[PDB]
């Protein structure tokens, strides 16, 4: 808790439920900080009764936390440890989780929105790369969106175990699930899952196909098919962060550029519509 500001409990105001987490209820409330203005918070509680691991794991994810500071991952405000509930507070992000988020929205953005929202997100895998951290669990309901529509990183929980707290084998590397190679080139790898999320608006990745087929059918060479009006230069760089050999997959400084690039020639991410409505 040396990355962490201890926060009195007469600074928070909790407002309302808005979610289950692993430990215990969160909330959406206002946090008072060193007399100006009160700011939005969601704050996270430990449930009471809980036991000595999971507050280990609890207050250890408030530590890796603080120790990031980048506008694309979630920002932690601080931390309540010597009283109780515990609690961990961060910004608030009004749109909630991004699966979620565009399956409310279906077709309600523009392909360049849709864009930038994923190069919002590689730039802040691309800080955590450069920190060696690998996430490992990256994911659109682990993204959260705030009213501006920006796309932070936000779920580093400890208590993580590969599936079959579960990380789900459809957002991860043959290489990681076969032989546990999580690396940087693991998590581009689930960035491309990210893509296609985006950019389906929030559809399942391998549909109700079961984990063993999915396996099956990716060490096959089965990759998602291209969702409907996906800029080929979209679908082209999701399928070069599925490459089977790691090291064929781009970095995500390299992911960036590219999004930069098409984000400065917008007129590749258009499709029929915007020619013919
Ligand atoms: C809506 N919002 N804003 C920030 C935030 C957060 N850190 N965590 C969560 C959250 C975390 C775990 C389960 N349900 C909600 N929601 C948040």
Redesign the pocket.
Known sequence: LKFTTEIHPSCVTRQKV?????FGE?Y?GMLKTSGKKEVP??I?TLKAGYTEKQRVDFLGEAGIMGQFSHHNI?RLEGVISKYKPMM?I?????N??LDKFLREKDGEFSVLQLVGMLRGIAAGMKYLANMNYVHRDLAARNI?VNSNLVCKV??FGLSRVLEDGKIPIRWTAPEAISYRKFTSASDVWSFGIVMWEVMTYGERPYWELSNHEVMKAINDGFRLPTPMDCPSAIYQLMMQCWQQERARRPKFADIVSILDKLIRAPDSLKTLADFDP
């Open positions: 808005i979610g289950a987490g692993e969160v959406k918070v969601a996270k979630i961990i961060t910004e608030y992000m009004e909630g989780a959260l936000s779920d």
